[PDB]
Amino acid sequence: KFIAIINTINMLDALCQFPTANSQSWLDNKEHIEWLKTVGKELELQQKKNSLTPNLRLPAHQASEQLMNILTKALDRNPNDLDALFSLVEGITSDDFRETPALLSHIYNKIIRSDSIDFWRITILRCLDIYSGKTASQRMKWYLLHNIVNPIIAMDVMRTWDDPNKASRLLDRTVIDSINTKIWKVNLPDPQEDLLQPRVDHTRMEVLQLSAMLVKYRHALLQDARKDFIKFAWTYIRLDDVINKHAAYVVIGYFIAHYETPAKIVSQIYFSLLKTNQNEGRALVTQALELMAPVMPKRCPFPPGDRNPVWALAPRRILAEESQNVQQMTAIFHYLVRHPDLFYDTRDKFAMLIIQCLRKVASPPNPSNDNRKLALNMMWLIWQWEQRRVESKLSAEFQIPSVGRHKMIRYLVEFIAQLNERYPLPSARPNELCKKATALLYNLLQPQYWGDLVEEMDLFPNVTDLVLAGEKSATLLSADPSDPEKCDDKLITSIINTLQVVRIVLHFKSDRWILDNMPQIQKILEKCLKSANPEIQDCLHMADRKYDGDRDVKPTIKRILDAVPESELIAWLSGIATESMAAGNYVSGINILWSLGHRKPSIIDQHIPAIMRSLQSKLARDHVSHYAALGHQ
Amino acid sequence: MATSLIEDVVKKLSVYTELKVKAEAACALRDSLDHYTAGPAYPAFLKKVMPVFIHILRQQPVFQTTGEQGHMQKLRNCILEILHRLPTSQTPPEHFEPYAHEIVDLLLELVRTDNEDNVILCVKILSDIMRHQHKIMSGKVQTFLNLIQELFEQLDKVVRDQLDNTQANRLLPRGMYSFKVLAECPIIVVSIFQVHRSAVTPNVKAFVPLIKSALLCQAKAQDQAHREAAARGTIHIGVSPNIKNRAAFGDFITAQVKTMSFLAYLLRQYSSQLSDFLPHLPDIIVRLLRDCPRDKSSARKELFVAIRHIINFNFRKIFLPKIDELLDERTLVGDGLTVHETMRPLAYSMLADLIHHVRDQLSPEQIRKTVEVYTRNLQDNFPGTSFQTMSAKLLLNMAECIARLPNKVDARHYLIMILNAIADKFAAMNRQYPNAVKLSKQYAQQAAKNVPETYLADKENPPDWDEIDIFNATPIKISNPRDRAADPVVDNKFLFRNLMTGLKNTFYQLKSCNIPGAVDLTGAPAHWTDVAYGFTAEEVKVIAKLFREGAYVFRYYEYMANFYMVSSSKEEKELLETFATVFHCIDPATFHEVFQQEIPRLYEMIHEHTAL
């Protein structure tokens, strides 16, 4: 019998392959459709088990698709006959057929895109009535019904996006009252007891999504159901499921933003949200906070001259209470960074905590990228606070204790030394975090800003020594750049970063400090000045506007030379240049001589011969040879 | 400073309004100790505060949670919080060490006699004390190990009382009959084992029977539910309605997962002591998977990570009989919404790894079930493409083993099913091209804007949508794409490249499964000797559809000689060569009767992508 069924299905599908023939009228008979559905259900059930003979698997597999396509084609005629559509949907969702794109591609282009305000309200009401209790429809059917309910509303919102306060004639009063009665007004005595059926969570999430969409896009139509909506949202918060609870929070936040509520509800919801610790639904909490917090001052005004808002102390309260949990700290920092203006006033109780937790947030040994981003973000937050204070003063305010500033500066120096990215350079062989961190470091040390701390600040001896004077680092720097084995990229990156750090810090130092500490500068820079690597030389000597992001930080060598009164440094540099040129390492000697000549021409006179010998022997010779070879090619 | 001193003297002379003031002062000191947690004056405060706390703690247990009872409960909460919240590190200037014996003994006695909402904090405090103050408190681990052994021994009787023999107005039971402390114990025990080493060799032998009995523990109601479900031939999942206290069942399952994690941790080196207990691991694991409440997704995630860690130890061979049982999607996932929306990739990836490692000894029915399940998974509409990539890679790897089945018909049918699934995926990818292009452009523009994101209507952002946005036009966002930072075009190209790589291997495997004597090869060119033969009338359709749909998915790479690299690049050209090479390994008759049909469609397709 299965072979006969397959042949009949194949012949029927072959028929109507050319709909432009008026030969599709045979599809209107209902007994034929019912019998087709019966035989299809039987054949599909047989397929589900490995019951068909081993020679008849693929033909039946294809006959199933043919049957589904024929059913969709039959439904296409007379779209308004929603009874057939509902029966087919119930069959699909009841594990009787196999879903095919034809059903959805028909729903779209026949119902969702129907060019009439009518035939949308009828469909919405029938779908709600099917949803509105009445049983006789499993949860999967309810979800697939919401699948068709929501797109109609979305399309209606789309088609009425214009200036003249376009009204939603589709969203008449009757439809809204029906939604209220069927979803909002209905108070479930014990919806928990109904949890003993599967897939209910999906229906609840779908109704929550519908409510959120309708609010966000038609807030001007809920003035007669504000109270019912609030009761609905508060009631659904009790759900034990995580995603449903967070969706309810999102909905209540939407309403709070788009309506007026007693401050008690806002405070309760906000406090409950802050205590949240589960890693699931983080984005939902982020959206809820982004919707709620900005309009908090309007919802919670404070007395003039009062700088202790309850909502301002609450984050501090939780920070103190749950300080043992790192995830809470990360969440509250993420929330805080996004809104610096609101907490500029209350920074008094936050700046010290931020400075203290800086170390905890990112582990110096090996942190994660998100931790690094969060640390840099809170650093930029405090920098923005300082800039705001300075701008307000220009257009006895709290200032951070010197100990906190020192700790922040040293941690920032260590972090930038340890950073992953490499500072861009003209000589790099063929970065945002490094640029931002260096820019922040430069901005902070300005004179009117914390720059007054430079005088008492040393040269970070521990960091600079451990990063530059290291024997492994020393030999790698003295190693051949050609050899990959001695080309440790991480050590080179750290050396470059610390070199930029010392350049920036010396740009602010005092000539007296440089003259006094000359031995230390010589000790630290002796290894690098001898390096035969172009990047190190460019870091030491070159200084361009393009690579500094509009920062006028003159090179280290130029600064130290200008510090010398119009000495020992000049003789040391001359000796280094002489030994480098003699050894055949032109890269260092040429740069050193360039800087020296830019300082005082008198010293290049005794060096002329070495430069001339190098030029006549190696550089120009090889350049001309290469270009002659290119001409030959 | 005066406020603290007056509060301290009031507390000292103590031995509603007065108790409320004392609660406020004590818990405010708890909150504000950050100004005084670290300092040279700590010894004075420590020695002055221990006696009062010890003296007050000697009173009888208080179970009511209202009025002055709640007041004193809060007093104790924010008083004992000081011990945990203090800087108890092992630094040289630690001052709690010389005065720890009496207080730790009193805390152990409190754990013995206190209640849940006190014993939990007491045991946590003891664990943190032992973590740092083990220098001179090393001699009292015997009492702690005896107490935890007593708790693990009485777990059975408390379970019996709570299941078999079974807010302000409530009465707080004793902590000895609470599953919360039992569930929290294993982490503390592991930490203690980490700290010391002098009491680990002999105590594990005593622990092993206790963990075995606990894991074997079961509820009669759920047991009979499972038995009746098996009798009916079906499988029962969820929570048995007979359970009057659902929270008790959830706590029992939480304790079970914690104990399973402890067993996985202990299996690292002490596996020799648990050798006899291996055969009961799979049945128990499936029982826990079936019995886990839907709401508690964290328990399911813990079970998945624990099972992965168990698998990594090369003990997969024992799971073979239950491989078929685990495949049923109901057993592995359940009805959880959060689970189904977040954790499916983890469970399916671990299952795929387990199947791949033990692929050698699979029976035909298991092969069929895995093929069906993962071909269904390949069609999932998950937002990303890592899940689909993993499914495709697993199917391609299993294709090699599918050719070894004793019966050639089954292997040929399964390979054909794999090819048909790949063709359907190609069609699905084809259907989404315009939406992917539009989303890529919109993402580029949005990233260019570089402004903070807000979830509200905006006249500058008209809400454009199309066929592919049928169920993705609602304000809620389960996971923001911004975190993913994903470009649809790149992901589609990645998946297409992976499938193209796998297709050649699949066809080569199919090339060595012909039924001998099916067709006659008396005279034929040597170029057509080892190619596959014997295609019915329903497989040529599959091959033609595969070619037609695959050739059209090259739009994602958007005169012809192109002597230099222009228009088409090296990647596209080599991919085209790889795709074309596949059809060099089929019967010449099939080649002719396929291309004589598909040539005009190709001629039409060339107009849109000239590189074809």
Side-chain angles (χ1 to χ4, degrees), chain A residues 58 158 161-162 195 197 199 209 240-241 243 279 320, chain B residues 85 294-295 301 330 338 417 458-459 463 465 474 476:
Chain A
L58 208 59
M158 195 193 261
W161 189 283
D162 283 302
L195 186 132
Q197 277 176 345
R199 228 71 56 184
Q209 288 243 58
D240 222 329
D241 189 62
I243 303 292
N279 56 76
Chain B
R85 261 278 290 279
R294 51 156 86 170
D295 181 34
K301 200 200 307 213
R330 274 288 201 280
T338 317
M417 277 290 106
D458 160 38
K459 287 240 158 166
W465 290 309
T474 64
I476 307 292

PDB file of all heavy atoms in Angstrom, chain A residues 58 158 161-162 195 197 199 209 240-241 243 279 320, chain B residues 85 294-295 301 330 338 417 458-459 463 465 474 476:
ATOM      1  N   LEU A  58      14.178   6.492   0.617  1.00  0.00           N
ATOM      2  CA  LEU A  58      14.313   7.788  -0.043  1.00  0.00           C
ATOM      3  C   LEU A  58      13.059   8.207  -0.801  1.00  0.00           C
ATOM      4  O   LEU A  58      12.695   9.397  -0.732  1.00  0.00           O
ATOM      5  CB  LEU A  58      15.529   7.750  -0.978  1.00  0.00           C
ATOM      6  CG  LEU A  58      16.253   9.064  -1.270  1.00  0.00           C
ATOM      7  CD1 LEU A  58      16.776   9.698   0.001  1.00  0.00           C
ATOM      8  CD2 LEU A  58      17.391   8.816  -2.240  1.00  0.00           C
ATOM      9  N   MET A 158       5.890  49.502  11.133  1.00  0.00           N
ATOM     10  CA  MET A 158       6.717  49.938  10.013  1.00  0.00           C
ATOM     11  C   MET A 158       5.954  50.885   9.094  1.00  0.00           C
ATOM     12  O   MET A 158       6.452  51.958   8.735  1.00  0.00           O
ATOM     13  CB  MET A 158       7.203  48.724   9.224  1.00  0.00           C
ATOM     14  CG  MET A 158       8.337  49.023   8.262  1.00  0.00           C
ATOM     15  SD  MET A 158       8.615  47.660   7.120  1.00  0.00           S
ATOM     16  CE  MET A 158      10.006  46.860   7.902  1.00  0.00           C
ATOM     17  N   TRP A 161       5.344  55.016   9.990  1.00  0.00           N
ATOM     18  CA  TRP A 161       6.506  55.725  10.523  1.00  0.00           C
ATOM     19  C   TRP A 161       6.637  57.034   9.750  1.00  0.00           C
ATOM     20  O   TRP A 161       7.356  57.119   8.754  1.00  0.00           O
ATOM     21  CB  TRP A 161       7.757  54.864  10.399  1.00  0.00           C
ATOM     22  CG  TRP A 161       8.955  55.414  11.105  1.00  0.00           C
ATOM     23  CD1 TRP A 161       9.751  56.440  10.692  1.00  0.00           C
ATOM     24  CD2 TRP A 161       9.501  54.955  12.347  1.00  0.00           C
ATOM     25  NE1 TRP A 161      10.758  56.653  11.602  1.00  0.00           N
ATOM     26  CE2 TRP A 161      10.626  55.754  12.627  1.00  0.00           C
ATOM     27  CE3 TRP A 161       9.146  53.949  13.249  1.00  0.00           C
ATOM     28  CZ2 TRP A 161      11.398  55.578  13.772  1.00  0.00           C
ATOM     29  CZ3 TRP A 161       9.914  53.775  14.385  1.00  0.00           C
ATOM     30  CH2 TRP A 161      11.027  54.586  14.637  1.00  0.00           C
ATOM     31  N   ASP A 162       5.935  58.065  10.216  1.00  0.00           N
ATOM     32  CA  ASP A 162       5.916  59.342   9.517  1.00  0.00           C
ATOM     33  C   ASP A 162       5.657  60.465  10.510  1.00  0.00           C
ATOM     34  O   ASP A 162       5.226  60.237  11.644  1.00  0.00           O
ATOM     35  CB  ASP A 162       4.862  59.352   8.403  1.00  0.00           C
ATOM     36  CG  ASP A 162       5.312  58.595   7.171  1.00  0.00           C
ATOM     37  OD1 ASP A 162       6.368  58.949   6.608  1.00  0.00           O
ATOM     38  OD2 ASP A 162       4.610  57.645   6.766  1.00  0.00           O
ATOM     39  N   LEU A 195       2.662  25.010  35.684  1.00  0.00           N
ATOM     40  CA  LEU A 195       4.012  24.718  35.216  1.00  0.00           C
ATOM     41  C   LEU A 195       4.235  23.238  34.928  1.00  0.00           C
ATOM     42  O   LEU A 195       5.301  22.880  34.415  1.00  0.00           O
ATOM     43  CB  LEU A 195       5.029  25.204  36.252  1.00  0.00           C
ATOM     44  CG  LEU A 195       6.506  25.098  35.868  1.00  0.00           C
ATOM     45  CD1 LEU A 195       7.227  26.403  36.163  1.00  0.00           C
ATOM     46  CD2 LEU A 195       7.171  23.942  36.600  1.00  0.00           C
ATOM     47  N   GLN A 197       3.238  21.480  32.624  1.00  0.00           N
ATOM     48  CA  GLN A 197       3.171  21.192  31.203  1.00  0.00           C
ATOM     49  C   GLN A 197       4.390  21.775  30.495  1.00  0.00           C
ATOM     50  O   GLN A 197       4.876  22.843  30.883  1.00  0.00           O
ATOM     51  CB  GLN A 197       1.896  21.775  30.577  1.00  0.00           C
ATOM     52  CG  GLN A 197       0.667  20.901  30.743  1.00  0.00           C
ATOM     53  CD  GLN A 197      -0.589  21.560  30.208  1.00  0.00           C
ATOM     54  OE1 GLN A 197      -0.614  22.766  29.961  1.00  0.00           O
ATOM     55  NE2 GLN A 197      -1.641  20.770  30.026  1.00  0.00           N
ATOM     56  N   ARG A 199       6.927  23.542  27.644  1.00  0.00           N
ATOM     57  CA  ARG A 199       6.973  24.615  26.655  1.00  0.00           C
ATOM     58  C   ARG A 199       6.144  25.834  27.041  1.00  0.00           C
ATOM     59  O   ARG A 199       5.960  26.732  26.210  1.00  0.00           O
ATOM     60  CB  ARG A 199       6.519  24.120  25.277  1.00  0.00           C
ATOM     61  CG  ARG A 199       7.440  24.519  24.133  1.00  0.00           C
ATOM     62  CD  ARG A 199       8.757  23.758  24.172  1.00  0.00           C
ATOM     63  NE  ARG A 199       8.562  22.313  24.156  1.00  0.00           N
ATOM     64  CZ  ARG A 199       9.541  21.424  24.257  1.00  0.00           C
ATOM     65  NH1 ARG A 199      10.804  21.797  24.378  1.00  0.00           N
ATOM     66  NH2 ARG A 199       9.244  20.128  24.235  1.00  0.00           N
ATOM     67  N   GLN A 209       7.389  39.547  25.238  1.00  0.00           N
ATOM     68  CA  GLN A 209       7.954  40.268  24.103  1.00  0.00           C
ATOM     69  C   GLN A 209       6.901  41.137  23.430  1.00  0.00           C
ATOM     70  O   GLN A 209       7.168  42.291  23.072  1.00  0.00           O
ATOM     71  CB  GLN A 209       8.544  39.279  23.099  1.00  0.00           C
ATOM     72  CG  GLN A 209       9.834  38.619  23.554  1.00  0.00           C
ATOM     73  CD  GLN A 209      11.006  38.956  22.655  1.00  0.00           C
ATOM     74  OE1 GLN A 209      11.341  40.124  22.467  1.00  0.00           O
ATOM     75  NE2 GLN A 209      11.637  37.931  22.094  1.00  0.00           N
ATOM     76  N   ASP A 240      10.086  31.586  38.700  1.00  0.00           N
ATOM     77  CA  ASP A 240      11.354  31.022  39.141  1.00  0.00           C
ATOM     78  C   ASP A 240      12.374  30.913  38.015  1.00  0.00           C
ATOM     79  O   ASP A 240      13.572  30.792  38.294  1.00  0.00           O
ATOM     80  CB  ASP A 240      11.127  29.638  39.755  1.00  0.00           C
ATOM     81  CG  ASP A 240      11.934  29.421  41.019  1.00  0.00           C
ATOM     82  OD1 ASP A 240      13.038  29.996  41.128  1.00  0.00           O
ATOM     83  OD2 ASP A 240      11.467  28.672  41.902  1.00  0.00           O
ATOM     84  N   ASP A 241      11.933  30.950  36.761  1.00  0.00           N
ATOM     85  CA  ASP A 241      12.844  30.836  35.631  1.00  0.00           C
ATOM     86  C   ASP A 241      13.642  32.123  35.459  1.00  0.00           C
ATOM     87  O   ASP A 241      13.101  33.227  35.565  1.00  0.00           O
ATOM     88  CB  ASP A 241      12.066  30.522  34.355  1.00  0.00           C
ATOM     89  CG  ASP A 241      12.971  30.182  33.191  1.00  0.00           C
ATOM     90  OD1 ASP A 241      13.709  29.180  33.284  1.00  0.00           O
ATOM     91  OD2 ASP A 241      12.940  30.917  32.182  1.00  0.00           O
ATOM     92  N   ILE A 243      15.310  33.504  32.804  1.00  0.00           N
ATOM     93  CA  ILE A 243      15.090  34.339  31.627  1.00  0.00           C
ATOM     94  C   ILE A 243      13.763  35.076  31.739  1.00  0.00           C
ATOM     95  O   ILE A 243      13.662  36.254  31.380  1.00  0.00           O
ATOM     96  CB  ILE A 243      15.161  33.491  30.344  1.00  0.00           C
ATOM     97  CG1 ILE A 243      16.504  32.757  30.254  1.00  0.00           C
ATOM     98  CG2 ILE A 243      14.955  34.369  29.118  1.00  0.00           C
ATOM     99  CD1 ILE A 243      17.697  33.667  30.035  1.00  0.00           C
ATOM    100  N   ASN A 279      25.313  34.597  36.184  1.00  0.00           N
ATOM    101  CA  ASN A 279      25.954  34.936  34.920  1.00  0.00           C
ATOM    102  C   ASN A 279      25.014  34.814  33.729  1.00  0.00           C
ATOM    103  O   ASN A 279      25.378  35.245  32.630  1.00  0.00           O
ATOM    104  CB  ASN A 279      27.174  34.039  34.698  1.00  0.00           C
ATOM    105  CG  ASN A 279      26.830  32.563  34.760  1.00  0.00           C
ATOM    106  OD1 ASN A 279      26.265  32.006  33.819  1.00  0.00           O
ATOM    107  ND2 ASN A 279      27.169  31.922  35.872  1.00  0.00           N
ATOM    108  N   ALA A 320      30.053  47.304  49.452  1.00  0.00           N
ATOM    109  CA  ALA A 320      30.574  46.902  50.755  1.00  0.00           C
ATOM    110  C   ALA A 320      30.088  45.510  51.144  1.00  0.00           C
ATOM    111  O   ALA A 320      30.872  44.685  51.626  1.00  0.00           O
ATOM    112  CB  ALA A 320      30.173  47.924  51.818  1.00  0.00           C
TER     113      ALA A 320
ATOM    114  N   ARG B  85      35.037  38.592  57.172  1.00  0.00           N
ATOM    115  CA  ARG B  85      35.376  39.795  56.423  1.00  0.00           C
ATOM    116  C   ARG B  85      36.732  40.379  56.798  1.00  0.00           C
ATOM    117  O   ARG B  85      37.219  41.268  56.092  1.00  0.00           O
ATOM    118  CB  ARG B  85      34.296  40.862  56.628  1.00  0.00           C
ATOM    119  CG  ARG B  85      33.291  40.951  55.491  1.00  0.00           C
ATOM    120  CD  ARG B  85      33.831  41.779  54.336  1.00  0.00           C
ATOM    121  NE  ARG B  85      33.920  43.195  54.672  1.00  0.00           N
ATOM    122  CZ  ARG B  85      32.898  44.041  54.642  1.00  0.00           C
ATOM    123  NH1 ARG B  85      31.684  43.649  54.291  1.00  0.00           N
ATOM    124  NH2 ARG B  85      33.099  45.313  54.975  1.00  0.00           N
ATOM    125  N   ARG B 294      13.740  21.406  36.041  1.00  0.00           N
ATOM    126  CA  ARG B 294      13.958  22.260  34.877  1.00  0.00           C
ATOM    127  C   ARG B 294      14.496  23.627  35.282  1.00  0.00           C
ATOM    128  O   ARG B 294      15.361  24.189  34.599  1.00  0.00           O
ATOM    129  CB  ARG B 294      12.657  22.410  34.086  1.00  0.00           C
ATOM    130  CG  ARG B 294      11.456  22.835  34.923  1.00  0.00           C
ATOM    131  CD  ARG B 294      10.388  23.515  34.079  1.00  0.00           C
ATOM    132  NE  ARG B 294       9.482  22.555  33.461  1.00  0.00           N
ATOM    133  CZ  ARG B 294       8.362  22.879  32.829  1.00  0.00           C
ATOM    134  NH1 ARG B 294       7.976  24.139  32.708  1.00  0.00           N
ATOM    135  NH2 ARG B 294       7.610  21.915  32.307  1.00  0.00           N
ATOM    136  N   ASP B 295      13.998  24.179  36.391  1.00  0.00           N
ATOM    137  CA  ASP B 295      14.373  25.538  36.772  1.00  0.00           C
ATOM    138  C   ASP B 295      15.866  25.649  37.055  1.00  0.00           C
ATOM    139  O   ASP B 295      16.512  26.619  36.644  1.00  0.00           O
ATOM    140  CB  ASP B 295      13.566  25.976  37.994  1.00  0.00           C
ATOM    141  CG  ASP B 295      13.888  27.392  38.428  1.00  0.00           C
ATOM    142  OD1 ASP B 295      14.175  28.233  37.552  1.00  0.00           O
ATOM    143  OD2 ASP B 295      13.855  27.663  39.646  1.00  0.00           O
ATOM    144  N   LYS B 301      24.402  22.574  34.247  1.00  0.00           N
ATOM    145  CA  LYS B 301      25.715  22.991  33.760  1.00  0.00           C
ATOM    146  C   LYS B 301      26.831  22.345  34.573  1.00  0.00           C
ATOM    147  O   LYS B 301      27.854  21.917  34.019  1.00  0.00           O
ATOM    148  CB  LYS B 301      25.828  24.515  33.807  1.00  0.00           C
ATOM    149  CG  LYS B 301      26.919  25.085  32.916  1.00  0.00           C
ATOM    150  CD  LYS B 301      27.314  26.491  33.344  1.00  0.00           C
ATOM    151  CE  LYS B 301      26.106  27.410  33.433  1.00  0.00           C
ATOM    152  NZ  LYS B 301      26.441  28.815  33.068  1.00  0.00           N
ATOM    153  N   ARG B 330      15.303  14.560  24.979  1.00  0.00           N
ATOM    154  CA  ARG B 330      14.623  14.795  26.249  1.00  0.00           C
ATOM    155  C   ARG B 330      15.542  14.497  27.426  1.00  0.00           C
ATOM    156  O   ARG B 330      15.582  15.256  28.402  1.00  0.00           O
ATOM    157  CB  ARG B 330      13.358  13.941  26.329  1.00  0.00           C
ATOM    158  CG  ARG B 330      12.134  14.581  25.695  1.00  0.00           C
ATOM    159  CD  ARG B 330      11.608  15.735  26.533  1.00  0.00           C
ATOM    160  NE  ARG B 330      10.214  16.039  26.234  1.00  0.00           N
ATOM    161  CZ  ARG B 330       9.807  16.750  25.192  1.00  0.00           C
ATOM    162  NH1 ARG B 330      10.664  17.243  24.312  1.00  0.00           N
ATOM    163  NH2 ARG B 330       8.505  16.972  25.026  1.00  0.00           N
ATOM    164  N   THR B 338      15.990  28.322  29.693  1.00  0.00           N
ATOM    165  CA  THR B 338      17.352  28.842  29.753  1.00  0.00           C
ATOM    166  C   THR B 338      18.345  27.833  29.195  1.00  0.00           C
ATOM    167  O   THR B 338      19.266  28.198  28.453  1.00  0.00           O
ATOM    168  CB  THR B 338      17.711  29.203  31.194  1.00  0.00           C
ATOM    169  OG1 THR B 338      16.612  29.887  31.806  1.00  0.00           O
ATOM    170  CG2 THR B 338      18.943  30.092  31.231  1.00  0.00           C
ATOM    171  N   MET B 417      22.146  10.235   2.707  1.00  0.00           N
ATOM    172  CA  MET B 417      21.452  11.135   3.623  1.00  0.00           C
ATOM    173  C   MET B 417      22.343  12.302   4.023  1.00  0.00           C
ATOM    174  O   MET B 417      21.884  13.448   4.105  1.00  0.00           O
ATOM    175  CB  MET B 417      20.995  10.369   4.862  1.00  0.00           C
ATOM    176  CG  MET B 417      19.690   9.623   4.682  1.00  0.00           C
ATOM    177  SD  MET B 417      18.279  10.733   4.543  1.00  0.00           S
ATOM    178  CE  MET B 417      17.927  10.613   2.794  1.00  0.00           C
ATOM    179  N   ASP B 458      13.742  55.840  17.388  1.00  0.00           N
ATOM    180  CA  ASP B 458      14.588  56.919  16.890  1.00  0.00           C
ATOM    181  C   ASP B 458      14.216  57.202  15.444  1.00  0.00           C
ATOM    182  O   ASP B 458      14.280  56.303  14.600  1.00  0.00           O
ATOM    183  CB  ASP B 458      16.068  56.549  17.001  1.00  0.00           C
ATOM    184  CG  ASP B 458      16.945  57.381  16.090  1.00  0.00           C
ATOM    185  OD1 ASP B 458      16.670  58.590  15.940  1.00  0.00           O
ATOM    186  OD2 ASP B 458      17.907  56.825  15.521  1.00  0.00           O
ATOM    187  N   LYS B 459      13.837  58.450  15.159  1.00  0.00           N
ATOM    188  CA  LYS B 459      13.464  58.820  13.799  1.00  0.00           C
ATOM    189  C   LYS B 459      14.635  58.709  12.832  1.00  0.00           C
ATOM    190  O   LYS B 459      14.416  58.566  11.624  1.00  0.00           O
ATOM    191  CB  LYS B 459      12.906  60.244  13.780  1.00  0.00           C
ATOM    192  CG  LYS B 459      11.518  60.367  14.389  1.00  0.00           C
ATOM    193  CD  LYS B 459      10.502  60.894  13.389  1.00  0.00           C
ATOM    194  CE  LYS B 459       9.086  60.521  13.792  1.00  0.00           C
ATOM    195  NZ  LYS B 459       8.067  61.286  13.026  1.00  0.00           N
ATOM    196  N   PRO B 463      12.758  51.560  11.076  1.00  0.00           N
ATOM    197  CA  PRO B 463      12.832  50.107  11.341  1.00  0.00           C
ATOM    198  C   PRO B 463      12.601  49.248  10.099  1.00  0.00           C
ATOM    199  O   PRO B 463      11.511  48.747   9.823  1.00  0.00           O
ATOM    200  CB  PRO B 463      11.734  49.906  12.388  1.00  0.00           C
ATOM    201  CG  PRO B 463      10.715  50.935  12.048  1.00  0.00           C
ATOM    202  CD  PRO B 463      11.463  52.124  11.496  1.00  0.00           C
ATOM    203  N   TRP B 465      12.887  45.952   7.819  1.00  0.00           N
ATOM    204  CA  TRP B 465      12.848  44.518   8.067  1.00  0.00           C
ATOM    205  C   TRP B 465      12.427  43.815   6.785  1.00  0.00           C
ATOM    206  O   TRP B 465      11.882  44.433   5.866  1.00  0.00           O
ATOM    207  CB  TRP B 465      11.890  44.163   9.211  1.00  0.00           C
ATOM    208  CG  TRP B 465      12.371  44.587  10.567  1.00  0.00           C
ATOM    209  CD1 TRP B 465      13.590  44.329  11.121  1.00  0.00           C
ATOM    210  CD2 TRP B 465      11.639  45.338  11.543  1.00  0.00           C
ATOM    211  NE1 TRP B 465      13.665  44.875  12.379  1.00  0.00           N
ATOM    212  CE2 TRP B 465      12.479  45.499  12.662  1.00  0.00           C
ATOM    213  CE3 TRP B 465      10.355  45.891  11.579  1.00  0.00           C
ATOM    214  CZ2 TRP B 465      12.078  46.190  13.803  1.00  0.00           C
ATOM    215  CZ3 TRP B 465       9.959  46.576  12.712  1.00  0.00           C
ATOM    216  CH2 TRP B 465      10.818  46.719  13.809  1.00  0.00           C
ATOM    217  N   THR B 474      11.617  42.210  17.946  1.00  0.00           N
ATOM    218  CA  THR B 474      11.082  42.520  19.261  1.00  0.00           C
ATOM    219  C   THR B 474      12.144  43.209  20.104  1.00  0.00           C
ATOM    220  O   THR B 474      13.341  42.957  19.932  1.00  0.00           O
ATOM    221  CB  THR B 474      10.601  41.251  19.978  1.00  0.00           C
ATOM    222  OG1 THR B 474      11.716  40.385  20.225  1.00  0.00           O
ATOM    223  CG2 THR B 474       9.567  40.518  19.136  1.00  0.00           C
ATOM    224  N   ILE B 476      13.227  42.910  23.165  1.00  0.00           N
ATOM    225  CA  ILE B 476      14.081  42.139  24.057  1.00  0.00           C
ATOM    226  C   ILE B 476      15.301  41.635  23.291  1.00  0.00           C
ATOM    227  O   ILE B 476      15.247  41.381  22.081  1.00  0.00           O
ATOM    228  CB  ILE B 476      13.317  40.964  24.693  1.00  0.00           C
ATOM    229  CG1 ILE B 476      12.022  41.446  25.356  1.00  0.00           C
ATOM    230  CG2 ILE B 476      14.197  40.251  25.708  1.00  0.00           C
ATOM    231  CD1 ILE B 476      12.239  42.304  26.584  1.00  0.00           C
TER     232      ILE B 476
END
